[PDB]
Amino acid sequence: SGISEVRSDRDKFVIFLDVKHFSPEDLTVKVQEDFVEIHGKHNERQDDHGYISREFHRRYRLPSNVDQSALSCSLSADGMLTFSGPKIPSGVDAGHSERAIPVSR
Amino acid sequence: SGISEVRSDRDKFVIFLDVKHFSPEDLTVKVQEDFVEIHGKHNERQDDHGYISREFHRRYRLPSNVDQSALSCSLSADGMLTFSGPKIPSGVDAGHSERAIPVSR
Ligand SMILES: [Zn+2]
Ligand SMILES: [Zn+2]
């Protein structure tokens, strides 16, 4: 869905960002103040002592019910960055059919 | 597969233990020295000032490649206890097609 697609549904929050002109090592992702801050900078030599630098920053609001301890981010072979996090479950019927048993370590 | 079924495959380790005569609060699960230690004790009044206590302990070896930080345990409506943990992935082709990007917090 173009350069940037942000989907937020009952179970998860996902950002898809096209960064095809970048290398994986050029990207940083940082979460602060309920924002996702994504940066990239990529430099290339061009003919006759030229060069090009491409750079971006994208700030996205993180939904308040995303679990910030379960965030993940990956870059696909074709240069799509996916950032995602699960939403914290509704407590309705928590433990109704199956019940969690604590595992002590 | 009877009282106790232990399955260990490429991706996970799972114990299924029938504890139908127990209540959820009667069970404890503790991991120590690469063992899972499961205990239950359940007491019931019976007629004419009688009572019955049922108790068990089951120790299971945890495979060395299970991720002990990702263990889970649940009790089903019909009284089956499931303990499971994922195995740590093989590193072969880690990041080959899609690459993890660190999320700094
Ligand atoms: Zn390049
Ligand atoms: Zn009972």
Curated annotation (Swiss-Prot), chains A, B:
Modified residues (Deamidated asparagine): N43, N65
Region listing for Disordered, in residue ranges: 86-105
N6-acetyllysine: residues bearing it: K12, K41
Cellular location(s): Cytoplasm; Nucleus
Main location: cytoplasm
Modified residues (Phosphoserine): S64
Family: Belongs to the small heat shock protein (HSP20) family.
Function per UniProt: Contributes to the transparency and refractive index of the lens. Acts as a chaperone, preventing aggregation of various proteins under a wide range of stress conditions. Required for the correct formation of lens intermediate filaments as part of a complex composed of BFSP1, BFSP2 and CRYAA.
Subunit composition and interactions: Heteromer composed of three CRYAA and one CRYAB subunits. Inter-subunit bridging via zinc ions enhances stability, which is crucial as there is no protein turn over in the lens. Can also form homodimers and homotetramers (dimers of dimers) which serve as the building blocks of homooligomers. Within homooligomers, the zinc-binding motif is created from residues of 3 different molecules. His-42 and Glu-44 from one molecule are ligands of the zinc ion, and His-49 and His-96 residues from additional molecules complete the site with tetrahedral coordination geometry.
Protein name in the entry: Alpha-crystallin A chain
Gene: CRYAA
Range covered out of full length: 59 to 163 of 173
